[PDB]
Amino acid sequence: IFKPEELRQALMPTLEALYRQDPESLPFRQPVDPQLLGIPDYFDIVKSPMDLSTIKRKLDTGQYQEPWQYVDDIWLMFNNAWLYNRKTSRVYKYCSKLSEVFEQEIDPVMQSLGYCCGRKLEFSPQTLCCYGKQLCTIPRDATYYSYQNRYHFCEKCFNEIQGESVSLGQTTINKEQFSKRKNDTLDPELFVECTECGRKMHQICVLHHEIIWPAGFVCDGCLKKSARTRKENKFSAKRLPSTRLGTFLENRVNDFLRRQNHPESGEVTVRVVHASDKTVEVKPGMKARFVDSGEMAESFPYRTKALFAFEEIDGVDLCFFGMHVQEYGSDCPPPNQRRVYISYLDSVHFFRPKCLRTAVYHEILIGYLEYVKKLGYTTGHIWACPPSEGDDYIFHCHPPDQKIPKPKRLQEWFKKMLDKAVSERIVHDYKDIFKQATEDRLTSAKELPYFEGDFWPNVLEESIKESGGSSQKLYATMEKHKEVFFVIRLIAGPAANSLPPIVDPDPLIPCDLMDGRDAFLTLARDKHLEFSSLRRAQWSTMCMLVELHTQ
Amino acid sequence: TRSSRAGLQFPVGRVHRLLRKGNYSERVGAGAPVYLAAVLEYLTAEILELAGNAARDNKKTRIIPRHLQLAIRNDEELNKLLGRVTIAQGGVLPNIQAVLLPK
Amino acid sequence: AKTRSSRAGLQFPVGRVHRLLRKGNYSERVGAGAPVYLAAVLEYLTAEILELAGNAARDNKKTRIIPRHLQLAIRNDEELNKLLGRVTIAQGGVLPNIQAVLLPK
Amino acid sequence: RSRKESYSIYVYKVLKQVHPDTGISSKAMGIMNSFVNDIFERIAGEASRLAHYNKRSTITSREIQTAVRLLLPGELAKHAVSEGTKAVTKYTSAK
Amino acid sequence: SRKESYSIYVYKVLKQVHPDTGISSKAMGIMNSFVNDIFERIAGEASRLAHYNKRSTITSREIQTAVRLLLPGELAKHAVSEGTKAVTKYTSA
Amino acid sequence: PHRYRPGTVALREIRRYQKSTELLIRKLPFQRLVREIAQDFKTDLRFQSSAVMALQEACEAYLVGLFEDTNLCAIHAKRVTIMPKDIQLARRIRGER
Amino acid sequence: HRYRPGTVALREIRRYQKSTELLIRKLPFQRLVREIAQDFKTDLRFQSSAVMALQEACEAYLVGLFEDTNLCAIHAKRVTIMPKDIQLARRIRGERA
Amino acid sequence: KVLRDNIQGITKPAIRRLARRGGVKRISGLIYEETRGVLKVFLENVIRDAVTYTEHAKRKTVTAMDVVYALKRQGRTLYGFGG
Amino acid sequence: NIQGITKPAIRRLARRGGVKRISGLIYEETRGVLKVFLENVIRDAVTYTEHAKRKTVTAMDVVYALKRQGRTLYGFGG
DNA sequence: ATCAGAATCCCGGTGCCGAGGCCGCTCAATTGGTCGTAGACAGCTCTAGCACCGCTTAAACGCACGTACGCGCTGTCCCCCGCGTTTTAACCGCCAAGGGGATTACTCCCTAGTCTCCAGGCACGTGTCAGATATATACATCGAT
DNA sequence: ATCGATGTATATATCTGACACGTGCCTGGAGACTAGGGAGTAATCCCCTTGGCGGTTAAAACGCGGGGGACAGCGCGTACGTGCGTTTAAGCGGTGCTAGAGCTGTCTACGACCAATTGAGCGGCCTCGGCACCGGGATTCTGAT
C-alpha cells in the first residue's frame, strides 16, 4: 500500500494528460447520461460505467490502494467506449487518441513506482478454423457461429447450407443451438506478486517460473536492497543432454562465429531433443498400384529427430531455430535406402548479431548434411515450401514483423546454402527433381523416394485416380514443380554402392512433446507460449526448457 | 462575475471586450477569453515571482525595473521569449569576458 | 467602362483587392479609395521587379524568366534587396561573389 | 476627463498572492502593464492568423491553446497550456 | 473548385513591360506569392495604424502612410506618386 | 603527370556551384532525416513531398547563409579556413542561437 | 600613486554594469534629435517623454552593438575594439545590408 | 519502421559543396560534425511548428503550406510553394 | 550637433557594454552609426505623427516606430 | 610574502515623497431572453502518399602524398591610458507666453447592405517552339621547365 | 617566357514537353437605391511645450609620460587538398495498395444582439515608512619591494 498522496502525486499528471486533450477528452470527462445523450441502450451494453471525473475523485479521495487499480479503471473507460461506439464513429477515434497518450504517459510513471512496466498486455488472438470447409478461416472481430466452443462456422458458409440443421462429426444440430459471436476476445497477461514488497508484475516481464524458483517471486528491487541474486536456473538449454550430432553442429556454428569475430556475438547451443523409430506407410492408391503386386514395399522405416538451437540474449536462453528430419537407414528397402529428408524447419528472428543470422542457419544445415554423409547416407531431399499464411511450422505465433519468404526467395536461400556446401566439398552436387529423375533414367513412380508428409505421395494418389489407373504424367508433374524439389548428392557414384551398414552412435531419445511438430504447437497454443516478441519468446523458451527437462 | 467563476485573477470581461473590438476575428468563442486570461495570469505570476526573488536577494522590498531586467535575463526560457525587448531603466547583466580579466 | 479596374487605368483587379480587404478582418469598414491605391502600388512593385528580371534574363540570352533571373534582379537592385531582405526564393541560387583575400596571388 | 484603463490592480493582486511581503514601484508597474499588453497582442494575433488559415471565422479556446504552444518556449508553453485547460474546466464545470 | 490567383494580371504587366518575353510557371508562382506577401504587409500595417488612431475605416490615407513606412525611399516615393495618380484618375470619372 | 596546386580546384568549385541553382543535399537521406526528426513529435505522420522539398530548400538557404557569414568571420580573423567556432560565433553575433 | 594601465577600465566596467542611469547627456542628445527631425518636417515639437524614449532606445542599441563588437575583437585575438569590429558585428547581425 | 542515426545522411562532401557555394575556400575537418548539429537545431525548430499547425487542423499530412507558415513565422519566409 | 555625443560619453557607453580598451576611430564610427539609427527611428516616428494630423511627436509614436523595427520598448505606455 | 594606500562595503541616523489604503461614483460587465448560422458530424469519392522491386551509374569513402597554412615565438614601435590642470555649458531652479491636444456639439455624405444582372476569369484541351542535350571546335588558363 | 594539358565557352543539330492560346461555363463583380452612423468641422479650454536668465559645479577638454598591446617577420609542424581506385546506395521506372484529404448534406448547439441592472474599478485625497543620503568605520583589493 502506497500513501494516497504518493499515488495522487505520481498518477494525477497522467490523468491531466488525458484531460488536456481537446476535443478528444470531452466525451469522457463526465459520467455518460444515456437519456440526455439520446442513447437508451447504453446500460444494456456497458455494465460498468467509468469516466475521468469518477477516476479523478477516487484518486483525490484515496480509493486506490495500488496503481494498477487506477490503470484498470482507465482501460475500463476506454474499452467501454470502444465497445459501445462504432469503429468509424467520433467517440471511438477520440478514445483511441486518449489511449495512445495514456500508454506513453503511464509506462515511465509505473516504472518510477518500482514496477516492471505500466503497459496493458494481452495475448494474440487464436485463428478460428471452420468445420464447413478444408482451410476456411474466421477473421478477427467479424461475426461467427459456434457450438460447444468446438464447432465454429464463418457467417458465409454457415448460411450457405440449405435448411436449419447442421451435421457435426454424424449427429444433427439446429442452427438455433449455435452461439452468434464476434472473434474479439483477448486474454490478458498474468501477474505475479513480489512476496516481499507485494508489487504485482507481469510474469513474462520478470520471467518467474514456479518450478525453477519454488520459494517464490522476489523482484529485482527487493533483491538488490539486500544485495541478493536469484538462485541459478538449472533448467537451461546447455544442461539438456548432449549428443554427437548436437555437439558436432554447435561446434561448427561456434567455430564459425569465432572466425567472424563480430562484436557482441554469443555462444550457440544445439540440442537434439527427440529421436525415435517410425514407419511411413504407402497410401491406398499407390499401395493398390504397386504394393499389392509386390513391386514396392508397403512401408518404410525411418528415424525421426528434432533439434533446436539456442542463444543467450540479455542473460536468458532464447530458442531461435528448430528442425525435424527423417532418416532412412541402410536396412530400409529401396527406393528410400540411405536417404534423409527435412520434414520442416523454422526460426524466430532474434539471433544476434543480425547480420550473421542467415549464415548461422546455413552452418546448421551444412553441418547436418556433412554429419549424415559421414554416417553413410548418400542423398538429401528438400522440399522448399514456405508456410501458408497463419500457419507455423514449429514455433507458435511468430513476430508480426518477421517476414515470410515466398517460394522463389526460399529456393534461392537453399541454393545459396548448398552452393556453400558444394564449395566445401560436402555436397557433391544437387539437382531439381526433374533433372535428377532424368539422370537416374527413372521410368516409374514406384522409383521415387516416399517420405512421410511429402508432396509426392499425395500428388501420386491424385494422379492415379485422375488417370483412372495411372506414371503417365510423372515427368510433366516433376517438370512443372521442379524448382521446389532439391535432390542433394552427398556420396556419388561407385562409392555409393559398396558402403558398410549405417550405424548411428547416438541413442534413441524418447520425448513425446517433440515427436513431430504437432505436440509442441499444441502445448504452446494451450499455454499461451508465443514467439511473437523478444520477451514472450524468452518466456516461451524458459517454459519449453522446463518441459523438456521434466518430461 | 466571471473572473471569480473560473478561479482567475485577471479580468475575463475586459479580455473578451478587447478580443471583440480589436478585430481579430468576426466572432469570439466564450471559452477563449478565459483561457487567454489564465495564460496572461500565469506569465505575470512567473515574472513577478522571479523579480521578487531577485529583489529579496538585493535587500529591497519594492520591485524596481532593474530587478525586472535581472529576473528576465537571468532565466533562460523567459530570455528566449523576451528576446528583442528593451526595458527602460533596465541596466545590463554584470559579465566580463574571461580574456579581459587580469592575469 | 464597366469594370472598376478600367476606370483607374490599372491592370491589377481592384474588385478582388477590395473583397480581400473586407474578408480578412483588417477593419470594420473599408474605404473606396484604398483598394484602388493598393492595386496601383501592387502593380507598380510588380512592374518594377519584372523590368529588372526581364533585363537580367536578356543578359543570359533567354526568353523565359526563371527563378534564377528573379533572384538576380532582386539581389542586384539596392532598394529591392532591402524590402526583400529576409526572403528565400526557392530554386533561386546566390549572387556570384568571391572575397578578395581568397583569390590567388 | 477621459477614463483610461490598465492592468495595475490585477498585477498587484498577483504580486500579493506570490510574494506577500513585496511592493511594486510605479515604473515597474508601467513595465508590467506594457508587458501584459504585448503578450496579449501576440497571442491574439496568432490565434487570428490560425483562424484565417483554417478558413474558420471564430477564435475558440483551441486556437488560443495552439497559439500558446507556438509562441512560448517548451516548459513555459507546457505550464501555460496546463493552466489554461484547468481554468477552462473549472469555468465550464461550476456555475 | 475555383482557386483564385494573380496569374493573368502579372502576365499583362509583363507584356506591357517586355512585349517579347515569357515567364516560366515557377517564376509565375513566385510572383503570385510575392504579390500576396506585399499586399498582406501593406494591409496589416494600415490596419494597425487605423487602430492606433482609434479609427474604424481604412481609407487611402492609411494605405499611403503604410507605403511610406514599408518601402524604402525611392520605391516609397514612386509608389506614392502612382497611388495618387491612380486615385485621381479614378475619382475624376 | 599533371596536378593542380592546392587551392585552385576550390575556386573552380566555388564558381561552378555559385553559377548553378540545383539542390545540393541528397534528396532521399534528407527525407529520411526529416521523417526521423518528425517522428519524435507525433508518431505516424505522413509528409506531402512538396513539403519535404520546401524544408530542403529552407535548410539549404539557412546553411548557405551561415557558411557565408562564417567565412566572413574567418577572413576577419586573418585566416582562410572556416572552423566550427566560426559557425558558432557567426550565429551568436547574428542574434540567433 | 599610479594604477597600471588596464585596471581602471575593469573598475569602470564593474561600476557601470551595476548602475542603470543614463550615460548620454540629456541636452546634447535632445539638440541632436531636433537637428535630425529638422530635415523631415519643419517646426516639429517633441514631447519630452518621447525624447527620453529615444535616448533609452539609442543607449540599448549602442550597448548591444559594443557588446557584439567586443565579442568580435576578442575572437580576433585582440583586446581593443575598433571601427571595423563595429561594422563587422553590424554586418553579421544582418542589421546593415 | 523505426528510424535512427539518419543524421549521417548529410554526407561530408554534401556539406563541402554547400560551403563551396557560400564562398568558403578551405574547410577545417571539425566543421563536418558541428554543422550537422546546427542543422538539427534548425529542423527541430521548423518541424515542431509545422506539426503544431497540422495537429491543429486535425490532419495527418504535413502540407507544404504548413511548412511555409512555420517558416514565415520565424522571419524566414519562403516564396514559391504557395500562399 | 553630432559632436554632442562626447568622446567620454561613448567611452562610458562602451565600458557598460564590456570592452576593456578602445581604439581611436571608434568614436567617429559610433557617431556615424548612431546618426543612422536615429535617422531611421525619427523618420518612422515623424511619418506616424504626420499621418495623425499633429505637430507634437508623442512618446507613443516613438514606441510604435521602435516596435515596428523589431526593437519593442517597454516602459512608456505601449 | 609585506607594507602602504586608495576603493568599497556596513552600519547607523535623518528626512521626504511616493506608494498604499480609503472614499465617491459612473459606466461597463452581468443576467436574461431570442434568433440565426457556423460548425460538428456522418457519409461518400478518389488522389496522393507509402511500400516495393530491380537495374543502372553517379556519387561517397578510403588512402597516399605533398604542401600551403595555422600557430607559436620574438622583436619593434606607437598609441591609448591614467592623471593632473584648465575650461565650459549641462543642470537646476524659476518665470513667462502661447500653440495646439483634447474635448464637445452638430451635420452630412460615404459605405454596408440588398437585390438583379452579366461578363471576367478559371478549368480544360491542344498545338508548337524555347530550351535541354549531344557533339565538334576554338580559346583560356594553370603549372612545370 | 613558351608548351602542353586541362577546362570552358561557342557553334550547330535534334527532340521534347512545358508554355501560350482558344473555348464553355458559372459566380463573383458591377449597377442602382436606401438607411444610418462614422467621420469632418467649428469652437473652446487649459495643459504642456518652448523660450529665457542666472548660478553652480560636474564633466568635458587638453597635455604628458610610458607601459603594454598591435603588428610584422620567421620557422616549424601538420591538417587538409587532390587524385585515384574501390564500394555504396541514390535515382529512376514502373507496380500495387489505401489512408486520408476533400467535398456535401443535414442538424443544432453556440454566439451575436438588445434591454435592465448594479458593483468593480477608476479618479481623487491623505498618510507613513522604504528608501535616498551622509558621515564615520572596517574591510578589501592593488601596486612597489
Residue numbers in the entry:
A (entry chain K): 1048 to 1216, 1223 to 1523, 1581 to 1661
B (entry chain C): 16 to 118
C (entry chain G): 14 to 118
D (entry chain D): 31 to 125
E (entry chain H): 32 to 124
F (entry chain A): 38 to 134
G (entry chain E): 39 to 135
H (entry chain B): 20 to 102
Which statements did the authors publish about this structure?
p300, a major human histone acetyltransferase (HAT), mediates vital biological processes and is linked to diseases, including cancer and neurodegeneration (Iyer et al., 2004; Lasko et al., 2017; Shin et al., 2021; Wang et al., 2013). p300 acetylates histones in the nucleosome (Ogryzko et al., 1996), the fundamental unit of chromatin, and alters chromatin structure and dynamics. In eukaryotic cells, histones H2A, H2B, H3, and H4, wrapped with genomic DNA, form the basic unit of chromatin, the nucleosome (Luger et al., 1997). To study the p300-nucleosome interaction, we used the catalytic core of human p300 [p300(BRPHZ)], consisting of the bromodomain, the RING and PHD fingers, and the HAT and ZZ domains. We now report the cryo-electron microscopy structures of the p300 catalytic core in complex with the nucleosome core particle (NCP).
To prevent the dissociation of the p300-nucleosome complex, we generated the catalytically inactive Y1467F mutant and removed the autoinhibition loop, which is known to block the catalytic center of the p300 HAT domain in the p300(BRPHΔAILZ) construct. The nucleosome core particle (NCP) was reconstituted with a 145 base-pair Widom 601 nucleosome positioning sequence. The p300(BRPHΔAILZ)-NCP complex samples were fixed with glutaraldehyde (0.1%), fractionated by sucrose density gradient ultracentrifugation, and used in cryo-EM data acquisition for the generation of the cryo-EM map of the p300(BRPHΔAILZ)-NCP complex (complex I) (left). The structure of the p300(BRPHΔAILZ)-NCP complex shows that the HAT domain and bromodomain of p300 contact the nucleosomal DNA at superhelical locations SHL2 and SHL3, respectively. In contrast, the PHD and RING fingers do not directly contact the NCP, and the ZZ domain could not be visualized, probably due to its flexibility in the complex. Although histone tails in general are not clearly visible in the p300(BRPHΔAILZ)-NCP complex I because of their flexible nature, the N-terminal region of H4 is appropriately positioned to bind within the catalytic center of the HAT domain. Therefore, the complex I structure likely provides a structural basis for the H4 acetylation by p300. The basic patch on the surface of the HAT domain, composed of K1456, K1459, K1461, and R1462, is located near the nucleosomal DNA at the SHL2 site, suggesting that these positively charged residues are involved in binding to the negatively charged DNA. Indeed, mutations of K1456, K1459, K1461, and R1462 to alanine substantially decreased the binding of p300(BRPHΔAILZ) to the NCP in electrophoretic mobility shift assays. Additionally, R1137 in the bromodomain of p300 is located close to the nucleosomal DNA at the SHL3 site.
